[PDB]
Symmetry: C3
């Protein structure tokens, strides 16, 4: 908590704590860490430090990337399977989280419950990096979604952002959508009216649209999301199954200097034949997170 | 002083010259980490983790420990193992003995561990059995006791909670007999009067007490334990063998309270430099580094 | 093989395997003397197993960890389980190889098919298990001096047998007499090609087929379709009518087919078999990643 930019020791719990000078740095780290790997430069950076993974939701992208990330800088990772943990013996979450805070130097916690994370973070001898909460924050996702947006399109400022799919529940879209307000972008929606109020305050446009087929011609980023059939309209359900879907047939009325993103997981929303399409940056999105974590973990531990 | 290759199955096999060394290793390994010195000690060697009880303190520490000296660890999940195709425990344990250089096995069954250990091309470090030992726990409980209070000899030790089932308390309570300490016991009428014949034989004083509120004024270590109201057949049993921060005011100031963990409602959460149960957990990691490293000949 | 997928045993040559073996010994002997192996330092392996195992994956884990690499513990149970490809490719973002094991007919071929990164089979529904077959050879070669000339008694339930179709076929790169021991219930499907390249004969039990046996390859049965269980069993009492210059193997797991008191027997190479896989993976992984 000193001069220059530095998170050294800082917890990483909400996206509110990031600045633009920090993120650009945070991005400048990732490219540099990436490029070391691309050429095979030794990374004894977090050699000897340890990361404690704690995930109570079901994931295999955040955690994996986090695992690859830690393992790439030289560090090690504590598999924590709650299923096979002393929780099957009645122990507090803090009790565990702190216990693990004894054997590790950072923490990566992911909990669905409303703010089980804030709590566990609150008192911790060691730092905690959010990966999910019940309140919907996901700074690492939001964080990585930017590099994609910046890398993919040259700059961030000016872009118009079509966020598509079920957004109400959407816990990733509150993380990015809000943070996007550090840039000059027009937000389109295809959403929780409660925290839509913070965004529009700072002038960040906000307009609702019928489907992709209409909102797409002025689109610089097509941010997609899993819907969930179960929990939809009611009897009727049908077209909204098909509308908020990106087939390769839709993608023909889409800008050519544009990129479509997905946090993932997905199922049938983005048509499998949309895989092989340069404008398809949803898989590279997954790849680039690994470097935010290396960009983050490494910094959050003072080794960069 | 050397266990190189030795199995680590019961607490009976430790000497005082060994443990002091075993402790002198831990501090030295600790202090390397505190400064950030490279530890290519068990670089290359591999540890095979095999746990059939539900834990996340012994195994984790063990994981951190191995990972810190440079080694790697085999995540062995029986759930996803050929057990679901159904093969012998030895079969597996030996199989894993093909891919690793040590082993850390934890089994509830009476002497599933002794067996698996018995025949093994590679060494096995106990972490729990049915019959009913836990040398690494006992081992680490000492450094806490020694580190926390200056010396081990002279201390009076209040072990509180359900002790009958207690598989950690038979590991330390016995071993404590290598020192000059007065053992006190606090239990719901329901310590196993089987293993107890051995400790008091050697004059390691042993006396029963009503609760903490009586046995605490002459207490150097308050060793706490999870009850298990799953054999109550008694909310005084609940609330008596409990350490609130309000009880802690009639407790010595040159004293420390320990817990192997896990816990639930027995110790009030609540900001007491006398609270060495979390640092207890931290200090195990270094027994394992102190042990694993030695048990593998790299120190 | 640099970049090559490893999906069926059809893609191996004898000059490749012998190299593939010459690597394993060399990698082994570095470990025996404790030589540093920064070989796959910085690369990452993504483990993806949908069957229940703890020998292939472990060996694979030890193997990767020994050359300096790291391993992605992928537990489908705690995973987004989205498409299998979706995942397999996703993991292909975070790793440099892949070790996939799927029971389904050709879930593996598929996932492999499109992958930015290489995939090393460990099991499929078609029954192909190149790493096992691969391994089973070094044992056969190491244990008996050479591979050519040996007569191979494969015993147990062979019909379902997914490991025996990996080795039995590949064995055809050598001059060996294949013998078979089964409960009347080997699949006469792949056998269209085994005897094409030239010996195969059926036998009543071990007690008859054993006197001209150089390798006694054993297998878990399936009480699920008695003498058919005690016959195709190797007690220590049977082992006395068995050649002295001969070795008995098992892919494992086992239960009661090989009598526990057959463990401590210098003709017993089924445990060393397990040990020697670790080095095919180091022999393979390392090569498959261009660091050797």
């Amino acid at each position: 908590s000193p001069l220059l930019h530095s998170l050294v020791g800082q917890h990483i719990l909400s996206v509110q704590q990031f600045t633009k000078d920090q993120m650009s740095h945070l991005f400048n780290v990732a490219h540099t860490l990436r490029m070391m790997v691309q050429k095979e430069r030794s990374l004894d950076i977090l050699k000897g430090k340890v990361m404690a993974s704690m995930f109570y939701e079901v994931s295999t992208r955040t955690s994996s990337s986090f695992a690859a990330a830690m393992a790439r800088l030289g560090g090690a990772v504590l598999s924590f399977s709650e299923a096979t943990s002393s929780v099957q013996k009645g122990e507090s979450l803090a009790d565990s989280v702190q216990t693990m805070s004894c054997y590790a130097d950072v923490v990566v916690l992911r909990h669905p419950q409303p703010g089980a994370v804030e709590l566990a973070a609150k008192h911790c001898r060691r730092p905690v990096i959010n990966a999910g909460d019940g309140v919907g924050e996901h700074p690492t996702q939001a964080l990585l979604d930017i590099f994609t947006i910046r890398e993919e399109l040259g700059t961030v400022n000016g872009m118009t952002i079509t966020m598509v799919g079920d957004l109400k529940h959407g816990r990733t879209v509150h993380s990015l959508a809000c943070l996007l307000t550090q840039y000059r972008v027009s937000l389109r929606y295809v959403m929780p009216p409660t925290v839509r109020a913070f965004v529009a305050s700072r002038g960040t446009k906000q307009e609702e649209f019928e489907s992709i087929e209409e909102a797409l011609p002025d689109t610089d980023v097509l941010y997609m999301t899993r819907i969930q059939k179960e929990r939809f309209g009611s009897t009727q359900y049908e077209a909204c199954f098909g509308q908020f879907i990106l087939t390769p047939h839709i993608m023909t009325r889409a800008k050519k200097k544009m990129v479509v993103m997905h946090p993932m997981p997905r199922v049938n929303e983005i048509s499998v034949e949309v895989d092989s399409d340069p404008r398809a940056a949803y898989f590279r999105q997954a790849e680039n997170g690994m470097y935010i974590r290396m960009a983050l973990l490494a910094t959050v531990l003072g080794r960069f």
